[PDB]
Design a protein around this ligand. Sequence first.
Ligand SMILES: [Mn+2]
Ligand SMILES: [Mn+2]
Ligand SMILES: [Mn+2]
Ligand SMILES: [Mn+2]
Lengths: 195, 194, 195, 194
Amino acid sequence: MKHTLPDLPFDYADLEPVISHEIMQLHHQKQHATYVNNLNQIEEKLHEAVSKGNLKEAIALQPALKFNGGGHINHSIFWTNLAKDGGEPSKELMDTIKRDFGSLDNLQKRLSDITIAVQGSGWGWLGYCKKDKILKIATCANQDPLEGMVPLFGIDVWEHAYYLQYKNVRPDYVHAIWKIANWKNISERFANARQ
Amino acid sequence: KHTLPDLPFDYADLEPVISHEIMQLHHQKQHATYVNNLNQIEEKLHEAVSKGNLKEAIALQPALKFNGGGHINHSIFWTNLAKDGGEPSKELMDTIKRDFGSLDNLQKRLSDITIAVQGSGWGWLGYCKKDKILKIATCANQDPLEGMVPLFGIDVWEHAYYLQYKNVRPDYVHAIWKIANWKNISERFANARQ
Amino acid sequence: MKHTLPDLPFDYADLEPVISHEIMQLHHQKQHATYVNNLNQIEEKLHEAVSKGNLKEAIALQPALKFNGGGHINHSIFWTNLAKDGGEPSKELMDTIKRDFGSLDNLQKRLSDITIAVQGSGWGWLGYCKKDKILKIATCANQDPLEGMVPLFGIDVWEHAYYLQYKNVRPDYVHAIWKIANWKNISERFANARQ
Amino acid sequence: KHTLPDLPFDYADLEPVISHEIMQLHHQKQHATYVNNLNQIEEKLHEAVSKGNLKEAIALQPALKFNGGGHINHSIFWTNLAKDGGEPSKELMDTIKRDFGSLDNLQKRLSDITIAVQGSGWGWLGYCKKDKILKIATCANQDPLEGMVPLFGIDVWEHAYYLQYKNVRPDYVHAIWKIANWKNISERFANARQ
Ligand SMILES: [Mn+2]
Ligand SMILES: [Mn+2]
Ligand SMILES: [Mn+2]
Ligand SMILES: [Mn+2]
């Protein structure tokens, strides 16, 4: 059934002064809405190509499904990842961060750095690799969804996520976003990934 | 489900340009595998889509492009080759002369880019309906040709020549022009113009 | 010798109301400056890797050279491509646009559309293909320089090029930029490409 | 300029796992070509850089990565194979057991991803000095392994197996473990830990 724009868990100004009201409103009401609308259109066209046996057409649609489907996935997670009252990591998550990265401080630095270094548009991720039972960090280009691991915490470093407030200074945004990291949600995602 | 098409000729009909063992393996093993895998991946993809698993549906894309591309590319390629391929129709020859100067220039230019492919892939002559022109391009791996109509393809995966030509890809790419099925290429051209 | 940030051919507010003063100032003084500074650093590291015979290291530096070197190339061209008094295409350029695209209106639409459709960060280009003696349009991802043809006119569709003024509405920017297309410069580039 | 290294063994020493014709062509023709081209491209690149032609220097990057990668990858690969490769040192075996459970799990997991390479490429076992762990990865075409130290590589370009194994890549990838030079792999491991 059809994809829909999820309501945010908070009002558009609830993350000030870390993320502005204007940024939240445009990012949700315009950017994410566009990914959803275009996603529904692409899924229709793909369902038609598959039904008709138009293999070339079905292949040709893949980048648009990845882009808009990834936009939907990534943003949906991102809204659940942000809070004014984020709390602290669960003990078990905190313990695993210490095991895999040494400390939360190291994790935040190492993820901030790779996220900061993204060339162009993309995302930084903290994820959980089920196979090897370890936390990992990665970046993704554009809206490519995080693959090979379960997403826990995402940082959108598309210039739309920060330019209106932080201008060119991407590092100020990436460092500041940790202050609104929704650790309750991130810990819930970690618990589910270990099931 | 998708099926392996029969070749329009016997496995040895392209000797001495492409060998029997190459045609047999290429068709019965390589193309077969793309077809069989295409069917498995299409099945996995339908489950993912019918269940709402967008992430898994996106994760299956590369296998669909690869095996689906494999099926598309090879199916065109077999129709592109002939023991006696004739000559290009007058309309195609005139178009080749318009857009490349001569057949010689087209062959050289398409051979050169196809030889230069880094890794596995394909060289193509195609027709851009929009700007009403012939174009040459390459594709990586089994990516299908997009943005123009395919007319003539040259498989430069190593499995396409190695048993016979060993490392000498250029010899294979220059030699395949001897068996280019110009009857088929011309028909694809005529159909691309309608 | 060392790369430097070129002075703009105009003052930071000279393209209002099509491109804001704030956008011009950040884009030149901060974004392009960063590409230049990082480019010089990367060229040094590459010259060292080559001198030492450190082939793996020289290969590893390539994405950063492409990114920052491309940033320098692309922006350098882009500033010369913009003017308040852009004039009109030379007769010969106009005649070739008509030959290859039917009309200027068609060219502007077709280039605007592909530029608008860029997934992520990138550029739209009008270029000249010397081999086939034809105008072409293309997009490039991120800062990848236009290859296979001589660049004539570039449209930066990184969100930094427009978000402060146009917000999410990229099409309004892409359509509007044609009003400040420096046709004198573009025509000069066309003449040189045909030599 | 770069040179083709001699093999540490005679062309037939890996029979029956890899044939004489494969080793000869692979070394004398494939690797030679990467070396020779590497030299040509390095020359073109130096002219571009010394003249300030940034655009042309960027345009030559893919040929440097490809031929330079080719030289890097093959040079490691020849040292990675042996008629009698021994067994992993105790320190490497313990590390393999820590990070993969057993040698069996490592072999299966690396074989599976290497077999799955779409097109040409390589499978690698490497060591991540930062997080102090073994990792497995694949690389496309001749891209060199980056972000970890290379320990053991498996060439899955078709030229590496086709003359002998034909289409049956899995057989070649499972069989190469028989000739993995664990003396060399262990030395690379010891050097990766210093
Ligand atoms: Mn976003
Ligand atoms: Mn093939
Ligand atoms: Mn820019
Ligand atoms: Mn090889």
